[PDB]
Every structure is written in C-alpha cells, then in structure tokens.
Design a protein around this ligand. Structure first.
Ligand code: M3T
Ligand code: ZN
Length: 257
C-alpha cells in the first residue's frame, strides 16, 4: 500500500490513484511574484473558541488530532470561501532534516514542516459527502520553521510517546488549536487536492504567509514517531511530504499587497 518510501512513495501513487496526475493536484510551489493580490477576497474568519478535541491517532502516515464536529463549533469562513467549513482534524507533514518537510513551497523554499487544519463544507452534511464535491474542503496550511519553541504545540509533542506506532491512539481532550496560529492571517489561496491518497480534488487551500516557529526539540520529537506498527521493524516517521505538483490551469491569489 502507499507510503513515502522508494517503492511506495509519491512517484508510485498514480497507479492506485490516477487522480495523482489530475488537473488540480496539491501541493504547489507558490511563486510570490506571480500570485496576484485580489482585493475582492473577504477577510478570513477563524473561530476556534469552542473547538473540542477528542483524540490523537497515529495512522501510519502522520498523526491526526481529531475534533468533535457533530455541532457548529470551530469554523472557518470568509477569505475565498462561500459558507462555513467545520474543523474535523489537523495533522502535520515534516522532514528528516530542518531543510525540508513542507508540502507547499514559497519561491521554491521548503520549510521544516507544514500544519494542515482540515475543514468540511457544512452544506454537504458530513465529511464523507463533502469529499465528493469540488468545494467540499477548506484546508488552512501553516508553515513551521525551527527557532523559538511554540508553547501551544507542547501538549501535542508531549503525547507522541503514547502513539509511537501505526494504529495507536490516545485521549486528547481540551487542546486549543488557536495556540498553533501565527499573528497574521495574510494568505495565498488556490483550488487543489488532498496531498495524500486518495488525493481527492476537493480542497480550497488557504496557505498562511507567516510561518510559526517551533523548536529544534519539538520537531525532533515528531521524528521519533514510527510509520510501522508495534512489533515491526522500526521505520522513523520522517519525510511524509509530497513534492510540489504542476500548477496547470490555476492562479494563486494573495489576500495582501
Ligand atoms: C484527510 C486529509 C484532508 C485534507 C488534506 C489532507 S493532506 C488529508
Ligand atoms: Zn496534509
């Protein structure tokens, strides 16, 4: 099955998921000089005050912090979006070395990691029906650079020892995702896809310009997770990023001058 190694990595995924070579795949390189400012973009609204986390799960590809999405809590709206998108989970993609890890790049620059806060369009009723629609998802993408620690991330780092291997989960209540946000909500936006199989083309990407800073110790703890299950040969969970894909017939728009 699919993964990030030599024999099952991104260059292989198209054989089980032909949409890998589709018309709106993600990630992409953001060429800052050609992303035009769009003064019709409305401002972005991130309302996370009532977010209710439940659990953290090592899925053998990344870890997911999962939210109760059964009520109208933790919503993203405004910016490029029509209507309201509900937070369901967040996860990260990261490298084996600080020089690589992000999925989107900015003028070919790779950041050490990238956070994806995944939201579904509430007009479609739940996540499963939303990923059958071209405007079913909105992903807020946030870059991480290594410098000062992010205090808001430490509760995640500290729980990773309890979900080292594929299939492990842990209770993870009362985590506040506002502590993972940078100061500015200036962003780039474009239509794209999940960056992991099944690579579905459902996503309005909203990629923040301002990275957050995490410490070298915080990211080193991500790199101690495992892709394998318990009792299997150890394969460190590193380099779980897909490289940039062809932009094709797409324009990237900037929310800021
Ligand atoms: C499940 C899911 C949703 C959105 C983006 C990614 S990379 C994955
Ligand atoms: Zn992702």
């Amino acid at each position: 099955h699919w993964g990030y190694g030599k024999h099952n990595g991104p260059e292989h995924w198209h054989k089980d998921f032909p949409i890998a070579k589709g018309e709106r795949q993600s990630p992409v390189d953001i060429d800052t000089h050609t992303a035009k400012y769009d003064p019709s973009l409305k401002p972005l609204s991130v309302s996370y005050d009532q977010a209710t986390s439940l659990r953290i799960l090592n899925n053998g590809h990344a870890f997911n912090v999962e939210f109760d999405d059964s009520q109208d809590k933790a919503v993203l709206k405004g910016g490029p979006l029509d209507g309201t998108y509900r937070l369901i989970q967040f996860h990260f993609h990261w490298g084996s070395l600080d020089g690589q890890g992000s999925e989107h790049t900015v003028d070919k620059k790779k950041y050490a990691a990238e956070l994806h806060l995944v939201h579904w369009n509430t007009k479609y009723g739940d996540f499963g029906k939303a990923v059958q629609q071209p405007d079913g998802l909105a992903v807020l993408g946030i870059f991480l650079k290594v410098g000062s620690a992010k205090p808001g991330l430490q509760k995640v780092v500290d729980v990773l020892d309890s979900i080292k291997t594929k299939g492990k989960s842990a209770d993870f209540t009362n985590f506040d995702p506002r502590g993972l946000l940078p100061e500015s909500l200036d962003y780039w936006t474009y239509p794209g896809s999940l960056t992991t199989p099944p690579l579905l083309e459902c996503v309005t990407w909203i990629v923040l310009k301002e990275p957050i800073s995490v410490s070298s110790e915080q990211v080193l703890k991500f790199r101690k997770l495992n892709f394998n299950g318990e009792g299997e040969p150890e394969e460190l969970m590193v380099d779980n990023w897909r490289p940039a894909q062809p932009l094709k017939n797409r324009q990237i728009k900037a929310s800021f001058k």
